[PDB]
Amino acid sequence: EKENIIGRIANLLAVGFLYSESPTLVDRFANALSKEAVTKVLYDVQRIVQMGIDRSEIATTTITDYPAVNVNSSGAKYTVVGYLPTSQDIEDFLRMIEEDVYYARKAGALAMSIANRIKLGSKQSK
Amino acid sequence: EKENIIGRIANLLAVGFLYSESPTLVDRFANALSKEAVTKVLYDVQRIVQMGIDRSEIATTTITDYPAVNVNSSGAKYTVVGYLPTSQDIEDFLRMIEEDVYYARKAGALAMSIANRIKLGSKQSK
Amino acid sequence: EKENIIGRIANLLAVGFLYSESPTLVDRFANALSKEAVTKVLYDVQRIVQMGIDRSEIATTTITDYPAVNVNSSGAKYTVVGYLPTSQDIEDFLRMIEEDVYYARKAGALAMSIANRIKLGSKQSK
Amino acid sequence: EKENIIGRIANLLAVGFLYSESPTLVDRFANALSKEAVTKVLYDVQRIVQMGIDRSEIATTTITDYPAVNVNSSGAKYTVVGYLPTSQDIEDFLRMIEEDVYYARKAGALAMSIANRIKLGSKQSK
Amino acid sequence: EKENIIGRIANLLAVGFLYSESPTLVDRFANALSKEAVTKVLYDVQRIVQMGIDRSEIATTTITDYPAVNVNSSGAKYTVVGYLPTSQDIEDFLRMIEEDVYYARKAGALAMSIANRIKLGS
Amino acid sequence: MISGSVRFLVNLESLNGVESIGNLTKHRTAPVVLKTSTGYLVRYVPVISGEALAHAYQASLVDIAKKEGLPVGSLSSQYEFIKFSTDEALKIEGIKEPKDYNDARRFEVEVMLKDVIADVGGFMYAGGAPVRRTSRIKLGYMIPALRGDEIPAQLEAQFHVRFSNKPVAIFNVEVSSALYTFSFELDEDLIAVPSTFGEKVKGEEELERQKAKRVKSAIKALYSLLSGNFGGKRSRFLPSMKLMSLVVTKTDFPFMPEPAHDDDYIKTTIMRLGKAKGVLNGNLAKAYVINNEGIEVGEGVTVLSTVEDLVVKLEE
Amino acid sequence: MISGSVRFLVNLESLNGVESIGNLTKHRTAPVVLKTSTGYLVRYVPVISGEALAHAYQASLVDIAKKEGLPVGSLSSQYEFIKFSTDEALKIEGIKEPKDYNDARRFEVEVMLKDVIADVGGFMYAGGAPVRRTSRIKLGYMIPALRGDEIPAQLEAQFHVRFSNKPVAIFNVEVSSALYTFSFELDEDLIAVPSTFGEKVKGEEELERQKAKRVKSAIKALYSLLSGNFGGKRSRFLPSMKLMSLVVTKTDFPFMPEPAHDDDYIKTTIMRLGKAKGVLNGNLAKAYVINNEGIEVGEGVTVLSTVEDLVVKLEE
Amino acid sequence: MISGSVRFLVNLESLNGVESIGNLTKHRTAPVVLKTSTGYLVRYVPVISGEALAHAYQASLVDIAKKEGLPVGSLSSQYEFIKFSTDEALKIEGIKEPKDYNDARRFEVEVMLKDVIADVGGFMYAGGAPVRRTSRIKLGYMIPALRGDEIPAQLEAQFHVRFSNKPVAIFNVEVSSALYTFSFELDEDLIAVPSTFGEKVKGEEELERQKAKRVKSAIKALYSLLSGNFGGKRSRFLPSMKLMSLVVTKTDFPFMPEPAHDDDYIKTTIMRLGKAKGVLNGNLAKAYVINNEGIEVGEGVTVLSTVEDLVVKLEE
């Protein structure tokens, strides 16, 4: 269940990165040494995702069925496979961070891997 | 009991956000650096909820049974699962804020998670 | 003892709000920036409560035993649990306001919480 | 499957080394005595590869067909044969490191062998 | 193919020894009792060879044609006859070491023989 | 008799060296064969010989005996355990050589009265009429447990340099860290008893009087071995030992416990103790167990906490 | 005897070095076997050799002896502890080599009346008549506590550059941080006492006269080791040290305190000391404890505050 | 000796840098082991290397020596402290390389009469006859106080852009804020004294004449370190520094004050100084304390107000 939470946090970070086209929040998350830095990124990335939801540029979908998130940014279309974190996942993840900030680095490494694979595939098709 | 208080404050913020369609109070709460900013948001969000109660657009209910709050806004129907804070929860939460303003960020992060999940589900059904 | 004074104050503001069906005095109290505004509300709310007492529409009671105040307004019956402030509580509260107007915001937030919970319960019944 | 994961991690390290012209990340990886050092290198090398992807100096290709990665650095062209690791390969590799840090030394030795063979061939053709 | 792999590892060790003028890595390789010691030497010798490649003091060549490696440790020019190991040779050699650390001693003995013959001729 | 199986944990240790090559001091290793799904793997694993333990035990016995006034030989007072082997050794102590076979027993008794170490430790005299005495304490090689599919032992080389102001200074030492196990046997019943047939010779009454003291000293000498006062290179490479598991059996008949190479070796030895007492018509059978790694023990065993209590109970 | 166990906390540390690769200076690392809830594992952890501690102790002893008027050897006056191993040292000091075995004692006395370092730390002479003297102070490697499932130690590399106005200057340094533990043991009852067996030789009266001063100096020399004056690279990488726990035991019989690996290693060693005094027929057993981390100690134990008080109490 | 412990509070700081990734400039970070009520933990915290402090101290010493007329080396006149390591520096300065070991002292004197920096901060020459001189000032890494369970330090990244009228200019800078602590040591009794052993060489009279001025300059040079003139990126990221606590001890014997990690580290170090003077047979022990945070100090302690008063008192 800890790995599932970390994977859902990594999906949130990857969606926020692909939508904003900025690595800055993922960099801050993977370099965090305190719960303050982690929590600030968790808010700021969800605030970016909230704008994408309100603009209908971020939407949940199913793809062949697996749960996925469609992201439209600057005329590029991306699809992240998996769920976004629940409020309980954020709370349980913050408790994991209060024990060991290592889990922020693990989620950041996964998020960057998701984003890199999607960006590589999108450039190849173009 | 501290987590239950924070969760009930997060439900109040999420109800106020969904009813007003404005993130401004949640943004102010999550960025608070003083007890003044937190207390001002706790009043302003409850004042918004009070208008929704008087209009019968905000009501307590049970859903399959879990306690919930129904919110009607702009022809959209939302349901937040959980209780709203008591006067004692507000007072105990303000005492927690007088010790550490971190708890306002925790409640804001939870509130935004609740609101985002509900908005995503409502857009998918439409 | 400061929290007990603030609580009794809340109770007076909540009784005055439920009896008058007007938030205007609580709004003025929670937005006060001077001792003048606070003192004016403390008089005006007690003047409203005095009319309710003379009409026998506001009465002290015990409820299972806790001290309470019964309020009859527009055919609605409300019960606020707790004591009303003494003359000494008003004088000590005004001394607290002369040090920090924050205590008026604290009392206003508590009063609105009491009133909201009572109004929600009354609408649900039936 | 463990050898395939190690080989894909070695390809990532070799691509990062050839693009950055710096052995420092491979040195850190092969000398790692903790999961912290390994995870830090896995982030930093992927961050270097991400810059090369954004600049279109790192691209996936096929060569006679085998999967390959083209790397352009300082006017030199290199081709690494194989796939880059997936997010699942990074996660499974980190689990292997949590059991035995030996796998970081194995991946580092393979990465340096790939880079050395490519650098030797490029100098001979010049 | 096992003897060809061992011979290519011995060529790598001999090139590293002739370039560094130090027997220490060959001594460590020939005395290894664990996969850890062998793998550490395989990295350190390749790191020395990488510096010689970057300085253009180690280069692949052909000599009469046999594949060879030229090594300049300054004016001291040496030529080792044969190929350097591939990444697959290192991986297959490490698998041989995981079965029997004897193969590290065999490669070390061959490497020292190559280096001694070249130093005597020079 | 007394039998024991003990499990040890040692870190950053170099106690038993071997022949030096070049400028390197090497550790003592032995080959083992490990079974894998693919096949078999031959691995070299560090060991400690059974002679250093005997030397440490004899030195501790000498130190304990000289405090209580028991007789000690001249060459054994110095830590040189040549014992009464050749004529030169006998010349210093002042013992006449045996005359013929029939007198051999007498000679033994004389030796047995002039040196306690020659009694408990045992001695051999080469010559026309040899005399023998088997050791009363039996020790085995210290080899780490071959448990599971992994050997918990390593061996590395460390580089050391000496500083001088006029260079014209380099050496290497092998260090190891393993999980050792060893077993031992002792027969306190045969102490102060001659080991040659014949007729009783004058002087056996002194041995009968000294039997109790010799037995007590021999039992006491086990404390040094069980505490970790063996081996060499303790001046600069002092190790860090620790006790994990210990089983000691006291019986009135031959018996030994199982080797401590498996994770469950106390239940087996208890069951075998019961079965052997059933068949050999024994009377006394007691087992003392010290457990620190939390392995299964069984039922019908007194549990101790330290090694001193074990020695006290053994002496009682 | 005086036996001690000490725990230290050190951060941003590099006092011991090994062979360098490229532009990287490496820190000494060793394998350790550690027990976790899942079994036993092997890890690689930075360590510090005991030879540096011995060198620091000997240098402090040299300084104290020179200050107090005790004789110091010519070569040992400079901080070069070659002692009397080679013939060049003997020629420089001016001591004739031993002729036969019977003269060895004389040679030892001649070495022992000139340098206190040879007396305390022992020495070796190799030749026709080899002479040996074991050190009276015993130390070991400095290993971090193997407590729990996670080792409280970390190692990393740091980047440094040298400035120059005409580039034509880059290096890396390894830095570690850990919670170290180590134990020590010195026998003050054998200081200023010859070890080679033989007859009386003129000059032992001076040794008997100076025995008290030599013992006092040897006890005083432990202050440097207990304070933190050891290791290299102190010019630019001065470490931050802080004492956490210390146990010192003074006995008339051999004893070894528990290693500082478990949180409860003071009560155990005190109980073991009491039982060992009971069983070994001792006559003196004292314990001193310095605690700064609020762990369990026990009852009836003297509690100190600093290390200087401990040194004064040991001297008295 | 002069040993000091200093506590600083710095906000919005970036004085030390490391390798950069992309458009991000990183701040040096190191692992630290910290003790909490739940045990021991490992954290990553920004730190500042001691080499920058050494460079600032040496530059200030160069300035003071040039102002006071003391000799300064040609290469050291420019702020490039290569000293006399390579042969190019020797050729530029004009000093012949040592021939054999016996000449080494002469070479040292020739280096010592030309540059005060080589005398104070030490130097190294590598070759046929290597020459070493350890620095007389010792510093360490600057680490924030490890007090309580929360580390009072924070690090973040900041965004910056470069303006241009024709876009075709974006970077990030790491900024930290912490409460730093560091300690230093300086032995003034060995300044202007040769370290290589040998015979007397002409030119030592000049060193004896200039010893007082060299010591005075070395003491004066500490003002820059105690004030806050160190580190880079001061043109656009000038930090805000404020002294909080300072302890300085002057002794005739080795001593080390407690690190500034605990709130009570002045009373402890004063008591330790008194006991160390008592036990080590010293003849001089003085302490100076500067306090601006209202923590416990003790009794019978001189209290100052600024740093200039401390420098004047040390000089006098």
UniProtKB/Swiss-Prot annotation, chain E:
Assembly with partners or alone: Probably oligomeric upon overexpression; does not interact with a Cas5 (Sso1441)/Cas7 (Sso1442)/crRNA complex. Forms dimer and tetramer-sized oligomers when overexpressed in the absence of CRISPR loci A-D; the oligomers are probably responsible for its toxicity in the absence of CRISPR loci A-D. Part of the aCascade ribonucleoprotein complex, minimally composed of Cas7 (formerly Csa2) and Cas5a, which binds crRNA. Other possible components of aCascade in strain P1 are Cas6b (SSO1437) and Csa5 (SSO1443), while SSO1399, Cas5b (SSO1400) and SSO1401 have sometimes been seen weakly associated.
Pfam families, per database record: Cas_Csa5 (PF09702)
Domain of life according to the entry: Archaea
Annotated TM spans: none
Disulfide bonds: none
GO terms, biological process: defense response to virus
A GO molecular function held by the record: toxin activity
Gene: csa5
Record keyword tRNA processing present: no
Entry keyword set: Antiviral defense, Toxin
Coiled coil regions, renumbered to chain: none
The protein, known as: CRISPR type I-A cluster 2/Apern-associated protein Csa5-2
Function comment: CRISPR (clustered regularly interspaced short palindromic repeat) is an adaptive immune system that provides protection against mobile genetic elements (viruses, transposable elements and conjugative plasmids). CRISPR clusters contain spacers, sequences complementary to antecedent mobile elements, and target invading nucleic acids. CRISPR clusters are transcribed and processed into CRISPR RNA (crRNA).
Further remarks about this protein from its record: The aCascade complex was purified from strain P1.
Claim: Calcium is one of the keywords in the record: no
Curated annotation (Swiss-Prot), chains F, G, H:
GO function term, MF aspect, one: RNA binding
Consequence when changing residue 160 to A: Significantly reduced affinity for crRNA
CDD domains linked: Cas7_I-A
GO biological process, one term: defense response to virus
Keywords: Antiviral defense, RNA-binding
Pfam families referenced in this protein's UniProt entry, alphabetically: DevR
Function: CRISPR (clustered regularly interspaced short palindromic repeat) is an adaptive immune system that provides protection against mobile genetic elements (viruses, transposable elements and conjugative plasmids). CRISPR clusters contain spacers, sequences complementary to antecedent mobile elements, and target invading nucleic acids. CRISPR clusters are transcribed and processed into CRISPR RNA (crRNA).
Similarity comment text for this entry: Belongs to the CRISPR-associated protein Cas7/Cst2/DevR family. Subtype I-a/Apern subfamily.
Miscellaneous note of the record: Crystallography and cloning were done with strain P2, while interaction experiments were done with genes cloned from strain P2 but over-expressed in P1. The aCascade complex was purified from strain P1.
Quaternary data: Part of the aCascade ribonucleoprotein complex, minimally composed of Csa2 and Cas5a, which binds crRNA. Other possible components of aCascade in strain P1 are Cas6b (SSO1437) and Csa5 (SSO1443), while SSO1399, Cas5b (SSO1400) and SSO1401 have sometimes been seen weakly associated. Csa2 is probably the major RNA-binding subunit. The Csa2-Cas5a-crRNA complex also binds target DNA homologous to crRNA, probably forming an R-loop. Purified aCascade forms a filament about 6 nm in width.
Name of the featured protein: CRISPR-associated aCascade subunit Cas7/Csa2 2
Gene name in the database record: csa2b
